[PDB]
Amino acid sequence: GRVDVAEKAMINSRADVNQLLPLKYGWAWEKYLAGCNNHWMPTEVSMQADIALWKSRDGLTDDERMMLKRNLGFFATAESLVANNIVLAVYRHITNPECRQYLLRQAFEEAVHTHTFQYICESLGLDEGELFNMYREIPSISDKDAWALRYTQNLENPIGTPEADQAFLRDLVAFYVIFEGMWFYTGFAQILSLGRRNKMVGIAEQYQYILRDESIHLNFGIDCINQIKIENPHLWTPEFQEEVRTMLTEACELEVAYGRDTMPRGILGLNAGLCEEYMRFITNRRCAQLGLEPVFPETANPFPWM
Amino acid sequence: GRVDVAEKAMINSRADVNQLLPLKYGWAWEKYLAGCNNHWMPTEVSMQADIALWKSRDGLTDDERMMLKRNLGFFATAESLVANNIVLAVYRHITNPECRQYLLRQAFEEAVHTHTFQYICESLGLDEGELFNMYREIPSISDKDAWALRYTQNLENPIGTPEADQAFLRDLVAFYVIFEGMWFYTGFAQILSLGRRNKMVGIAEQYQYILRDESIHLNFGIDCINQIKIENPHLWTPEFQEEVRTMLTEACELEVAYGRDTMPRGILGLNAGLCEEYMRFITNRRCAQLGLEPVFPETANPFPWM
Ligand SMILES: [Fe+3]
Ligand SMILES: [Fe+3]
Ligand SMILES: [Mn+3]
Ligand SMILES: [Mn+3]
């Protein structure tokens, strides 16, 4: 009574989920190997330059500091939200050992990312309460997290029905495509912009590591949605496609509101309009990766260096 | 409305579990840092010698091969059982960010350990089905896993009552103290015995890495049980202490049955009696770490080199 590859599935599989071999989803196994080879620790990056620039007076404009605090405050608790969604929602529904294997890698990388913001907070001497509670004090940040949390909560408060599998797909889109593949990429562009100006390079280097992990996290999650679409064609209905297109649209309006609140006035080489262009370009890119009609007109990448 | 350390607790905490700082359980944070610094991959260990010894005729006695297959077959799927218990049971009930931080590390290390047995199975050319389905075909292995699984299932099929928190404590004992801290240690002694005879050294070296992770996994889980005992003194009743002492007793009888079936005749420098002595010594050691009356008389360590 050993497991055959035909018995294994992304969701609602009857095969023994405790048996890794034989592998069916090689693409999932490949991501796990790539994630492991990207081992890094935030304490490996020196913060001396960033600490000096932070404590100094002329080091950063008041707009740059606020942009930095809002970005850090958003990322500090967002990584925990993604990690909790993996554990409490994604892991249960993916009935596949090799995919769960990568989820364990991804979850741990979220702990490294969370570690990165404890290290930044402790290094720069930031207020822990102000930074980690920022996602309940700032409306622009709170609206983004509350919006993504609903798709996590909806799974927990509903047995393999089409509505159930569609609700799980909404969760994968909200966290892999939107949270990690859109909101984080926009926040990455803001911080890396300072790094390109040789400002807060220690924070920027850690963001480069997080972005490398984030690229695999997104790549895996798109593959999951696409792999689930292959095995469950009945789930990718025209109504659900418009649901996902609508989710991307709201998520962009939440980030526009966030970008405006984070950068009232644009800083050197960065503003809310350019971030609106990048978010609009990335969103269209996510639509193409999901086989979705783009929600915006053709938009160039304002940051081709990302 | 920021989080104070007084609001944070091991279980049933009301503090925002999404906010890592301020840290209350430094011991949990310390384990996470130690786990990360133990980064290793099973593919870093060469198997050429082990592959040659395996394919050769005189390389291993028939008793050694069976002992090796049963040990591998047990560990190949046991790591998934521990990982699933972390995600589906332990993570939900531990209402604490720094402890969840380590759980994400531990869960990933379980994926590395599971990776180790895919690598061993693929290297030695073992039957994947025979190895990964062995825990449903061998009664001695099946009885052990089925016994531990009940404590995972009982949590999933019952809201913060004393019975609920005691059932979660039974789960921590079953998987941290018994599964990882007893059954794995006994299985470690069997394989490392071959390594000390310069037999299957590649497998033995990987087991040394797993044992290093396993020591932290056990250390963390004992700390969790002890930390929960501090904050919930009403849970550590005399009846529950005897429940745990009874769990350890059954778990030892399941391993005695496993040891006998795995080693009918003892091999060079190893037999079921010595493994019974080690299990009995380790079990008494676990009792002392939990503030429990030992279940066996004073027993020396047959393997002081472990
Ligand atoms: Fe991520
Ligand atoms: Fe373990
Ligand atoms: Mn992340
Ligand atoms: Mn393990």
Author numbering:
A (entry chain A), B (entry chain A): 23 to 180, 184 to 331
Source paper text:
Within this work, the possibilities to perform SSX at BioMAX, the first macromolecular crystallography beamline at  MAX IV Laboratory in Lund, Sweden, are described, together with case studies from the SSX user program: an implementation of a high-viscosity extrusion injector to perform room temperature serial crystallography at BioMAX using two solid supports – silicon nitride membranes (Silson, UK) and XtalTool (Jena Bioscience, Germany). Here we have presented an initial integration of two SSX environments at BioMAX in order to collect diffraction data from micrometre-sized crystals of membrane and globular proteins at room temperature. The environments were different fixed-target scanning supports and an HVE-injector for LCP extrusion experiments. Data collection using fixed-target supports was comparatively fast, simple and required only a few microlitres of protein crystal solution, which could be grown directly on the support.
Data were collected using U-turn raster-scanning applied to silicon nitride membranes. The sample preparation and deposition onto the membranes were the same as for galectin crystals. The exposure time per crystal was 0.05 s. A total of 68 061 images were collected. The hit rate was 58.1%, from which 22 224 images were indexed in the space group P41212.
